[PDB]
Amino acid sequence: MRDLKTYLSVAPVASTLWFAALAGLLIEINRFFPDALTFPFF
Amino acid sequence: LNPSLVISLSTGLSLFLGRFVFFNFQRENVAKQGLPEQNGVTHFEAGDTRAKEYVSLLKSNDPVGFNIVDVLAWGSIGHIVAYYILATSSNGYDPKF
Amino acid sequence: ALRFPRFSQGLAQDPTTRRIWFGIATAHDFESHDDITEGRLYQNIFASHFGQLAIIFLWTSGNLFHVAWQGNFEAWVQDPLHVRPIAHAIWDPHFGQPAVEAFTRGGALGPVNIAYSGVYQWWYTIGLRTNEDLYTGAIFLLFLSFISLLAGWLHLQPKWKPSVSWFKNAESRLNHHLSGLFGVSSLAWAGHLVHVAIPGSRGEYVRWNNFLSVLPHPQGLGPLFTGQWNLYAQNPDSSNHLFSTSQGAGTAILTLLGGFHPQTQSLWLTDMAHHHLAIAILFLIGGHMYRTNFGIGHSIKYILEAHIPPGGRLGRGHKGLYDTINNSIHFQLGLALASLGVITSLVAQHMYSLPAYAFIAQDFTTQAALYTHHQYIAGFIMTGAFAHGAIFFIRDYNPEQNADNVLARMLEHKEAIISHLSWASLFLGFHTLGLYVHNDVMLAFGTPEKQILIEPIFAQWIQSAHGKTSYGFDVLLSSTNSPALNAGRSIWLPGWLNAINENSNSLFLTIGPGDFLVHHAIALGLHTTTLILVKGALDARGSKLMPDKKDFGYSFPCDGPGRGGTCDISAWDAFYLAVFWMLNTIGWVTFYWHWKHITLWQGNVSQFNESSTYLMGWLRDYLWLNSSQLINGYNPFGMNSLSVWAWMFLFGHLVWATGFMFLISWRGYWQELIETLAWAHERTPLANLIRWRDKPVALSIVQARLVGLVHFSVGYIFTYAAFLIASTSGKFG
Amino acid sequence: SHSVKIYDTCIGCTQCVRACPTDVLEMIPWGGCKAKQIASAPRTEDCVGCKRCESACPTDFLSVRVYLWHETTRSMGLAY
Amino acid sequence: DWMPGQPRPSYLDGSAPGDFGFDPLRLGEVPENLERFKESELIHCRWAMLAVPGILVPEALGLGNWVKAQEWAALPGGQATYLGNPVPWGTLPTILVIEFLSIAFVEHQRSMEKDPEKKKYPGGAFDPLGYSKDPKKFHEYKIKEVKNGRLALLAFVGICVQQSAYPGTGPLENLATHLADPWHNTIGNVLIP
Amino acid sequence: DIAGLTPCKDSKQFAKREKQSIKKLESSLKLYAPDSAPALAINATIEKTKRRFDNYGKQGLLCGADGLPHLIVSGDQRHWGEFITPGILFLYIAGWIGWVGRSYLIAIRDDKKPTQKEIIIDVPLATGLVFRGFSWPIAAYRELLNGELVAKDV
Amino acid sequence: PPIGPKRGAKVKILRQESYWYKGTGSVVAVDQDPNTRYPVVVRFNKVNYANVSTNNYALDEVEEVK
Ligand code: CLA
Numbered sequence A: 001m002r003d004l005k006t007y008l009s010v011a012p013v014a015s016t017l018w019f020a021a022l023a024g025l026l027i028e029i030n031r032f033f034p035d036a037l038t039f040p041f042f
Numbered sequence B: 001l002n003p004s005l006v007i008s009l010s011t012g013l014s015l016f017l018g019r020f021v022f023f024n025f026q027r028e029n030v031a032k033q034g035l036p037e038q039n040g041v042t043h044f045e046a047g048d049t050r051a052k053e054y055v056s057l058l059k060s061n062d063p064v065g066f067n068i069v070d071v072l073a074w075g076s077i078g079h080i081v082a083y084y085i086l087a088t089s090s091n092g093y094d095p096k097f
Numbered sequence C: 001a002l003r004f005p006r007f008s009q010g011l012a013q014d015p016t017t018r019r020i021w022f023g024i025a026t027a028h029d030f031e032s033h034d035d036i037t038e039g040r041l042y043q044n045i046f047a048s049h050f051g052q053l054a055i056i057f058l059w060t061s062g063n064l065f066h067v068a069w070q071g072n073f074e075a076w077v078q079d080p081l082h083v084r085p086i087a088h089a090i091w092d093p094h095f096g097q098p099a100v101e102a103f104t105r106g107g108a109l110g111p112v113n114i115a116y117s118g119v120y121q122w123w124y125t126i127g128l129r130t131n132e133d134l135y136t137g138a139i140f141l142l143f144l145s146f147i148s149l150l151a152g153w154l155h156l157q158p159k160w161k162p163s164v165s166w167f168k169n170a171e172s173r174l175n176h177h178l179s180g181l182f183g184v185s186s187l188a189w190a191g192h193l194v195h196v197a198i199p200g201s202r203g204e205y206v207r208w209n210n211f212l213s214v215l216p217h218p219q220g221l222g223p224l225f226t227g228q229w230n231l232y233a234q235n236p237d238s239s240n241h242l243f244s245t246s247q248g249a250g251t252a253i254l255t256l257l258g259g260f261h262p263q264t265q266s267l268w269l270t271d272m273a274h275h276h277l278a279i280a281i282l283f284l285i286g287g288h289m290y291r292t293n294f295g296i297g298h299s300i301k302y303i304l305e306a307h308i309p310p311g312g313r314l315g316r317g318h319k320g321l322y323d324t325i326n327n328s329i330h331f332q333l334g335l336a337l338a339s340l341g342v343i344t345s346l347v348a349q350h351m352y353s354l355p356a357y358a359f360i361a362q363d364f365t366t367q368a369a370l371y372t373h374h375q376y377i378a379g380f381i382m383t384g385a386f387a388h389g390a391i392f393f394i395r396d397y398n399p400e401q402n403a404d405n406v407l408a409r410m411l412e413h414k415e416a417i418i419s420h421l422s423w424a425s426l427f428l429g430f431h432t433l434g435l436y437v438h439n440d441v442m443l444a445f446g447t448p449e450k451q452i453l454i455e456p457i458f459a460q461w462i463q464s465a466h467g468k469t470s471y472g473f474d475v476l477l478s479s480t481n482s483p484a485l486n487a488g489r490s491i492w493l494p495g496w497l498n499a500i501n502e503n504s505n506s507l508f509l510t511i512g513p514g515d516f517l518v519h520h521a522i523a524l525g526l527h528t529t530t531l532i533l534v535k536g537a538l539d540a541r542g543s544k545l546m547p548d549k550k551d552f553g554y555s556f557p558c559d560g561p562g563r564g565g566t567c568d569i570s571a572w573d574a575f576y577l578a579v580f581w582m583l584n585t586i587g588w589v590t591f592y593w594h595w596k597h598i599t600l601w602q603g604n605v606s607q608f609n610e611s612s613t614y615l616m617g618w619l620r621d622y623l624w625l626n627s628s629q630l631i632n633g634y635n636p637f638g639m640n641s642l643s644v645w646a647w648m649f650l651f652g653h654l655v656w657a658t659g660f661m662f663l664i665s666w667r668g669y670w671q672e673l674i675e676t677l678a679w680a681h682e683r684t685p686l687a688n689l690i691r692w693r694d695k696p697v698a699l700s701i702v703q704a705r706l707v708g709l710v711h712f713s714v715g716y717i718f719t720y721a722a723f724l725i726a727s728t729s730g731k732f733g
Numbered sequence D: 001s002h003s004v005k006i007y008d009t010c011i012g013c014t015q016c017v018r019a020c021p022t023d024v025l026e027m028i029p030w031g032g033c034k035a036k037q038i039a040s041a042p043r044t045e046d047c048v049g050c051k052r053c054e055s056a057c058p059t060d061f062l063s064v065r066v067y068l069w070h071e072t073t074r075s076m077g078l079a080y
Numbered sequence E: 001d002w003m004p005g006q007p008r009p010s011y012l013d014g015s016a017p018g019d020f021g022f023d024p025l026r027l028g029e030v031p032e033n034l035e036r037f038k039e040s041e042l043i044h045c046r047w048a049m050l051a052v053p054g055i056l057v058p059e060a061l062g063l064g065n066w067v068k069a070q071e072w073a074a075l076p077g078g079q080a081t082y083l084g085n086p087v088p089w090g091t092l093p094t095i096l097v098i099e100f101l102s103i104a105f106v107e108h109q110r111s112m113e114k115d116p117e118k119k120k121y122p123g124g125a126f127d128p129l130g131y132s133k134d135p136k137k138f139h140e141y142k143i144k145e146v147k148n149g150r151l152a153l154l155a156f157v158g159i160c161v162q163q164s165a166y167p168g169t170g171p172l173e174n175l176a177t178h179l180a181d182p183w184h185n186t187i188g189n190v191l192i193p
Numbered sequence F: 001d002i003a004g005l006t007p008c009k010d011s012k013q014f015a016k017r018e019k020q021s022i023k024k025l026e027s028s029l030k031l032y033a034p035d036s037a038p039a040l041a042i043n044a045t046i047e048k049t050k051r052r053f054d055n056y057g058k059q060g061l062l063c064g065a066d067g068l069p070h071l072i073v074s075g076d077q078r079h080w081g082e083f084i085t086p087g088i089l090f091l092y093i094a095g096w097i098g099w100v101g102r103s104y105l106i107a108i109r110d111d112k113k114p115t116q117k118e119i120i121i122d123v124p125l126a127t128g129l130v131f132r133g134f135s136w137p138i139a140a141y142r143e144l145l146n147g148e149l150v151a152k153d154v
Numbered sequence G: 001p002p003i004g005p006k007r008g009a010k011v012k013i014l015r016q017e018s019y020w021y022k023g024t025g026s027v028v029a030v031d032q033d034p035n036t037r038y039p040v041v042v043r044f045n046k047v048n049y050a051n052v053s054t055n056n057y058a059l060d061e062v063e064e065v066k
């Protein structure tokens, strides 16, 4: 548990989880505001 | 317009300037800059026989030291600007405001 | 001595084949020869310069003689646009009958080569008309090269050899080279253009036997001395003028028009005469700067030492630079190579946009060949400039004599320079590649409008400032009440604005987003090549991985496998690595130029404008598309005149590929293979009766890197030249 | 013949001597350190230029340096 | 002090005529540059103090502005005009070269001195009235001089940038259009168009 | 207009591209059941394509001779949405990332085994540190003014 | 009277052929012996390229820093 928490924070696993979260975020963002070549709000 | 008028006048003015106005300045600058040197010696003192200053023709009888090569330089300047004046005075060019 | 090579005792005692190899590859490194002094070094350099001059003159006269003998000149001057120029005849006993019939072009009586050097247009522009002219020229050049050899010999005995003191006289040499080598030469060329070429472009045939009988101007030399110089421009050639005929010709010898000749699409001859005259005047006046035996002028050393900024941001300024430049031959060579390379690529950029020779703008593949040739040469020269900078820093740099001047302060903050060069190249690479890949994906998914096209608005604005009127910016020279446009409106602006706003030439081609992307590829190439070279130069004297590199020389294998491994740690290895990037960047440059022009020459510029923004466009619409005739040079159904290129094209692919061997496989492998080969030879009957005299060894480490680089670059040059000449020559447009 | 030099930063560890394939180096008395020993190179005519000795030097920078030089058949390690 | 509450540069104590401790770029850090700087500042100030009356008073009279008054030369048959009279030696080249060698002679004569205080304050033939008799009335005259001169430099740079803002207009014309409607004819419309 | 380009909404090649694009998808919809899963998916992307073209038209993009929306980066205020405001957003996000990383590196530099906290992230410390990136611009400005952003001594 | 910096000090390196040149290290021991040309022994927090973290130096090569 403590050691599982440690292993889940080793560099490869920390980075894969981080990048999976980032990928999910970007994917959803472009799923809501697709085909965006500019910033049209202000 | 009269080319010879202008050439003689301009080179005479340049020579007057060189002998009576900028002489001392040019002399002190040529003194403080000195002879070119390689490795601390002048070019003649390093073994170059051809790089010896021509002390015979450089000495002159002018009260201040005006000699052949400086009349050459000043007069050539006078001629250059005289011909510039002639050429541009009859090129017929005109800009516009 | 007692063996080849004699300039080296350490190599002469080498019992292996290495002695031969290295014996050849260090022949001109005079500073590393046995019993070398400074006098020997300088005198050998002088003599070999004379030898190189002899080689150059022999080469150009070989060109002239062959064009005169087996050429096409007299027929070509009659109709420059509808006949192909011949370089020389072909005699190849390996040729077949259909090859003989296929190569007989240009109206010749046998197989010939078609010239793409552009010597026909050059010689036609300057005045040569008949074969007798070319024969006299070739004979004169043979004479000149013989005299060059005679001088090279004469200045090698005692009795005539100069002292090192003479070679280091910088002020007088600069005086002469500026005023005499550049000034009087340019003045004489203006004289030839005024006396021979300008009349030759109006019908008259001025030659040696009559040039004292012909006035170049109706009022010869009166205007010059009376001051009324304008009389030498009072009647230019009318704009409906056939080149070597008097139909529509004038009498002006000097002028400033700026446009092109309407028929030939090249610069006016009188404009070039005036240009050479003007720059001759400038060089002559500027060559009286430095002090010599006459007690006036400048002392370069004093000017250098006087340029030190108070506030000490530059340390000691340039104090001590005269002596480190005058005593270092590698510093001088690096400066010469740098300036020469920059002006070489300047030549390349100016010769395609402002052509000087008649009917060369309409010979497209001559244009392409000239551009690519000069750009590759400029790239090699730049790499050499940096290599000799590094060699200087190792061999001729003296730290204590250069205490705190600009050179030492360059050396002492090398980390900042290298890190920032690396940042710039990382930024450019990341973003240029990223934009290209984004576009490629956008077009793979079938959505053209989802691309990230950036308009090169700064270059378009500059083009507008020169007078182009296709982007509607209305700046200088494309304004209407500007001082710039009004001030030259009567001298050269008419012709200039007429030529720039014409869109059938190459003077300031229209640019779009593809031009933006490829220019940033160019910028990345330049920055990365300079990163490699500058890192090699500033790290030549030692780094943290090897602090004592300077006493190992310029080129060495490595520093063993210790401390993590030190493969390719020399500065020679940095040069070796930078040549790859030089080749790559010049490749990008020449690809860009060739594709833009090959689409402009077909009136299909939209093809480039649209397919240049993604790399599949470059692959398919440029490489795969323009390569059909070339690879069809010969096929199972016969061959045509392109076969020689189709062959060379594959040749360059082979060479390139074998260059990979020497670059990937390393020495140990080959050495052990060679040793078992030696066993095999010594152990076999009827052949152990024959014995080698040098023990066979695998190539050295540095030698192998050199051989692989040579193979790589030769293959590169050959395959690209084949493709370029075959793809432009096939369409001839 | 390659040229091997020993510099006075030598701590006389002798790891390099125990590393060389051709018995070029040696240990000799000295007084400049706590081992009273320093490395000598009396037989550099047998040095192959392998530079194992440099990878065994624990000093910084190295105290044993091999400068490759003119090649012999001994230097090139050729058995034919 | 040029800015109350700001420490002074060490090399600028306050004895020199006109020293108010202004040197944000620290250009006068090295004393032998500061000497030349004092000299050049005085020369500039004197030129501009002479120039600004010459820019203003002819336009105050019925003549063209300072830039209109120097544009006949841009036309081939250029002929000057002083007070409404065509000067005889009025063409461009005569004017140009007489001005050239006149100024060159006098300027060389000026920099052929190595006092270096008479370099800025030569006096003698240039002090007919002899206002340099009292060494402290002299000092406050020095202060008044460099003060008025800095003001005149300011006024001149203002004149020329106003000219670049309203091309073909004179400074008094600008004063006139400002007085015509002060609340609407100001720098505002040239800062925010 | 700028660089000779024309407003895509009024361009003809931009429209022609839109109609051509929309045309091919419609063909893919055919030869299947009118209300099938694949047909429904093709319809969805057709509407998506129409929305993208109308969105491009609405945002006032510049179209060349090929009808492709070119991007102006010179600084013209009619076009900041194309490069400059996205650029400011990027610089903000990248400064966030870099500042958080630098903050973390500085915080863990004081242990005996600092490499241990680099191959194995201290996630509690990292989560304490991540949100300082929000104010990273002010913090970095005041660190530069303080003189503590750049290491002296090097 | 001992020689060189005291034990445990913080000294800056001045030998430019050293990996830690212009860096800092902690003194471990300076032999009081004469006859030794490099008495100071310095330990660093970073290995060099040879994976070594201690080195001997002469008294002039080290310079006690703050
Ligand atoms: C197509 C081949 C290729 C490519 C892409 C590169 C690319 C690069 N070279 Mg290189 N080079 C090459 C061939 C190549 N080289 C060859 C044949 C030689 C001769 C041996 C050299 C010799 C050479 C030298 C000597 C140097 C470089 C340098 C560089 C870098 C320059 C900086 C830059 O442009 O930013 C980046 C450009 C890129 C193209 C990187 C794009 C890759 C992206 C980031 C992939 C993104 C990953 C993505 C998320 C998915 C990953 C997949 C997953 C499995 C992980 C760059 C990464 C210089 C350098 O180091 O710069 C400081 C350097 O000094 N090169």
Ligand code: CLA
Binding pocket: C024, C025, C026, C027, C028, C029, C030, C380, C381, C382, C383, C384, C385, C387, C391, C554, C555, C572, C575, C710, C714
């Ligand atoms: C005015 C130009 C110039 C001059 C005078 C020199 C002069 C010199 N160079 Mg240098 N150099 C130059 C330009 C020049 N270089 C350029 C442009 C480059 C970039 C390519 C270099 C890169 C360079 C390097 C990397 C080195 C030198 C070195 C040297 C020194 C010894 C050269 C030597 O003798 O090796 C012997 C000559 C050869 C080995 C040439 C034979 C092999 C060539 C390269 C192959 C030719 C290609 C092939 C035959 C043609 C294709 C075959 C066919 C199918 C068409 C010498 C003083 C060397 C040196 O010692 O530094 C001090 C050194 O290492 N140069």
Ligand code: CLA
Binding pocket: C045, C046, C049, C050, C053, C166, C167, C169, C170, C172, C173, C174, C176, C177, C179, C180, C181, C182, C185
């Ligand atoms: C007026 C006197 C004079 C003249 C004419 C020369 C002339 C020359 N000297 Mg010399 N020299 C002189 C005085 C003079 N020197 C003195 C007083 C000294 C004592 C200090 C020396 C010491 C000296 C040394 C040590 C050396 C020379 C060398 C040379 C040769 C230079 C190499 C070369 O030919 O490249 C040609 C250069 C040009 C043609 C001009 C440059 C053109 C530029 C680069 C570009 C042109 C662009 C244009 C478009 C070209 C058209 C192309 C198209 C036609 C195809 C050259 C012929 C070198 C040599 O001897 O080589 C054998 C050399 O080693 N000189």
Ligand code: CLA
Binding pocket: C654, C657, C658, C659, C660, C661, C664, C665
């Ligand atoms: C296209 C590039 C290329 C070429 C031509 C070769 C060629 C060769 N490789 Mg190599 N290799 C390459 C790439 C290449 N390699 C690369 C990139 C690598 C890195 C992985 C390697 C790694 C490698 C290894 C590890 C080995 C080889 C070996 C060999 C040799 C195999 C024996 C043989 O085939 O005899 C015949 C020669 C040929 C087929 C070459 C073509 C012969 C031409 C067509 C004949 C023309 C003759 C002509 C008339 C000459 C006269 C011209 C005159 C003007 C002088 C051979 C010469 C092996 C070897 O050494 O063999 C014992 C070996 O072990 N290669």
Ligand SMILES: CC1=C(/C=C/C(C)=C/C=C/C(C)=C/C=C/C=C(C)/C=C/C=C(C)/C=C/C2=C(C)CCCC2(C)C)C(C)(C)CCC1
Binding pocket: C330, C331, C334, C335, C338, C342, C385, C386, C388, C389, C390, C392, C393, C537
């Ligand atoms: C390594 C080394 C070296 C080498 C180096 C090099 C190689 C360098 C270079 C460099 C380069 C290669 C450079 C270049 C340059 C250029 C420039 C810098 C430019 C320019 C210009 C300008 C400024 C312009 C202007 C103009 C005009 C005039 C008109 C029109 C407009 C314009 C703007 C265009 C040496 C030996 C020395 C030393 C040692 C180290």
Ligand code: SF4
Binding pocket: C557, C558, C559, C560, C561, C565, C566, C567, C568, C701
């Ligand atoms: S170049 Fe060869 S010998 Fe040198 S370190 Fe690399 S692998 Fe070892």
Ligand code: SF4
Binding pocket: D004, D019, D020, D021, D022, D024, D025, D046, D047, D048, D049, D050, D051, D052, D053, D054, D066
């Ligand atoms: S190079 Fe090799 S053989 Fe020579 S001393 Fe070093 S380890 Fe021994």
Ligand code: SF4
Binding pocket: D006, D009, D010, D011, D012, D013, D014, D015, D016, D017, D038, D039, D053, D056, D057, D058, D059, D062, D063, D064
């Ligand atoms: S390994 Fe280095 S320090 Fe140790 S004995 Fe050998 S040469 Fe001396």
Ligand SMILES: [Ca+2]
Binding pocket: C499, C500, C501, C502, C503, C504, C505, C506, C507, C508, C509
């Ligand atoms: Ca054009």
